Amino acid sequence: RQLVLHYQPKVLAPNGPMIGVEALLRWGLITPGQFLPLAEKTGLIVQIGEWVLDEACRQMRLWLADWNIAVNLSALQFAHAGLVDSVRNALLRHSLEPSHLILEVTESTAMRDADASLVILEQLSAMGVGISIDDFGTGYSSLLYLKRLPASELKIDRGFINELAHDSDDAAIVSAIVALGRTLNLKIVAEGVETEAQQEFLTRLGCNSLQGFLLGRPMPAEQLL
Amino acid sequence: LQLLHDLRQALERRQLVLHYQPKVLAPNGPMIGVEALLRWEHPQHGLITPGQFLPLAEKTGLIVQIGEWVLDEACRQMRLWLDGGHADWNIAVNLSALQFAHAGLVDSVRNALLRHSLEPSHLILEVTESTAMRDADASLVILEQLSAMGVGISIDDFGTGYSSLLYLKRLPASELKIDRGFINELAHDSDDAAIVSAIVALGRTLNLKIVAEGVETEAQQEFLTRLGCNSLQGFLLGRPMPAEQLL
Ligand SMILES: Nc1nc2c(ncn2[C@@H]2O[C@@H]3COP(=O)(O)O[C@H]4[C@@H](O)[C@H](n5cnc6c(=O)[nH]c(N)nc65)O[C@@H]4COP(=O)(O)O[C@H]3[C@H]2O)c(=O)[nH]1
Ligand SMILES: Nc1nc2c(ncn2[C@@H]2O[C@@H]3COP(=O)(O)O[C@H]4[C@@H](O)[C@H](n5cnc6c(=O)[nH]c(N)nc65)O[C@@H]4COP(=O)(O)O[C@H]3[C@H]2O)c(=O)[nH]1
Ligand SMILES: [Mg+2]
Ligand SMILES: [Mg+2]
Ligand SMILES: [Mg+2]
Ligand SMILES: [Mg+2]
């Protein structure tokens, strides 16, 4: 068992309290960018995912701790026939309210076969699980399906969060995502917040919550305290 | 289902209208505003009341655009009235639980006031006790924004939910509205008069105006006045009616 979760805080804007964490997988000390693609191609991602989901639910129970936890799903995990049985079973196993668990799938993953995403996410949403669309702005979305999917939040891609000059293309895109949130009834999370000016500007643009190194780096449950 | 199809097209068919009910200083003092109340003029069923279709609207999400239309028309009407010289009237608009939690609520209020050049102090937003107290920390963030814009905040159907006195003081509410259920039962239950008195006393000690709602009889009016209610609303003082008929 060399697999460990690190947790990164999500924080209500403007400076408001921490409302939850994202679980981030780690393995020397190996980062997931170095091995998740091999796991995806080989199918080992599905067992690793079962372990991640279980450990996140276990940790949340242990804490419960007035907050929720977000787990990432790769394209294979999202499409895997077992996914929805397994989410329901993991919440049942730990007697954990479904409102405490968030599942993140990327824009690309969700939009690849939107009708199939809809069958899967509708089940998940009827069970009460929070559904987040990650890396938003980096894929291709149908506005029609963006409304139809029972998502509760979009997470702005880290790639748009750099110098964020007021007249930048990046700022326009952040504004557009915020406006999608406002018109489609979705919370918007900015990810990759490293500086005070980003925090301030993203808050004024109307992001609902923030994640990034400035607010807290990923760390193991113990160090998080 | 017929109701579902019919409600979907109700805005397209201009079948939705606002009626307005006077709120009056107690006992019968000047009218200080109105509550906007949605009605549906149905070509087959006639004038349908919102208890008969707002739950379907909530469940389907049709309540969002129905609410945009309600807010727009209410703001239009208040503007018109202000320009007609009714300087001391406000208008109160109801918010369901879904509208109160909608990510765009505050932007939509700001846009509607700007569209009709309406000072924010002439708009009152009513959220029920239950709605406000379900997640009080979240209610606080929402209501503080609305209150900083200058919009009045009313806690509706008061007495029907469960309130934290702590958050009841922290919320930037301006008024509590006693639920009509407590007014109607006064002649038929000894507990109701105590409950109504307690609500009035909460207003007095937390610095909130109290509105008594559902006033139908002279004796209710007299009793509520003697208790010290600030304002009254009810059939005795004036039923909901269209803006024109109200005059
Ligand atoms: N430069 C910078 N980076 C920041 C900042 N704040 C957070 N990050 C990093 O950005 C990534 C956020 O996760 P992601 O976009 O979902 O993207 C994740 C996610 O797609 C994938 N991944 C991580 N854990 C899991 C997992 O348990 N399951 C699955 N299926 N995928 C995972 O690996 C990707 C990269 O993971 P990480 O290395 O942990 O990198 C994490 C996080 O450490 C910041 O302020 N500045
Ligand atoms: N028996 C009796 N009833 C009286 C008397 N005085 C006032 N009422 C009624 O009490 C209700 C007061 O509104 P509410 O408690 O906010 O309760 C409202 C409110 O929750 C909701 N509603 C109405 N319009 C709207 C709207 O535009 N948006 C939203 N979200 N909800 C609305 O529907 C509920 C019922 O609306 P209405 O049928 O118009 O019923 C109205 C009004 O007609 C009286 O003396 N006797
Ligand atoms: Mg993620
Ligand atoms: Mg991301
Ligand atoms: Mg009301
Ligand atoms: Mg009421």
Author numbering:
A (entry chain B): 448 to 474, 480 to 516, 521 to 681
B (entry chain A): 435 to 681
From the paper:
DGC domains containing the signature GGDEF motif synthesise c-di-GMP from two GTP molecules while EAL1516 and HD-GYP171819 domain-containing PDEs are responsible for the hydrolysis of c-di-GMP to 5′-phosphoguanylyl-(3′-5′)-guanosine (pGpG). Hydrolysis of c-di-GMP by EAL domains has been shown to require the presence of divalent ions, either Mg2+ or Mn2+, with the most efficient reactions occurring at alkaline pH2933. Here we report as yet structurally uncharacterised EAL domains from the core genome of Pseudomonas aeruginosa, PA1727 (MucR) and PA3825.
Both cytoplasmic DGC and PDE domains are required to regulate the levels of c-di-GMP controlling alginate synthesis. We determined the PDE domain structures of MucREAL and PA3825EAL in complex with c-di-GMP/Mg2+.
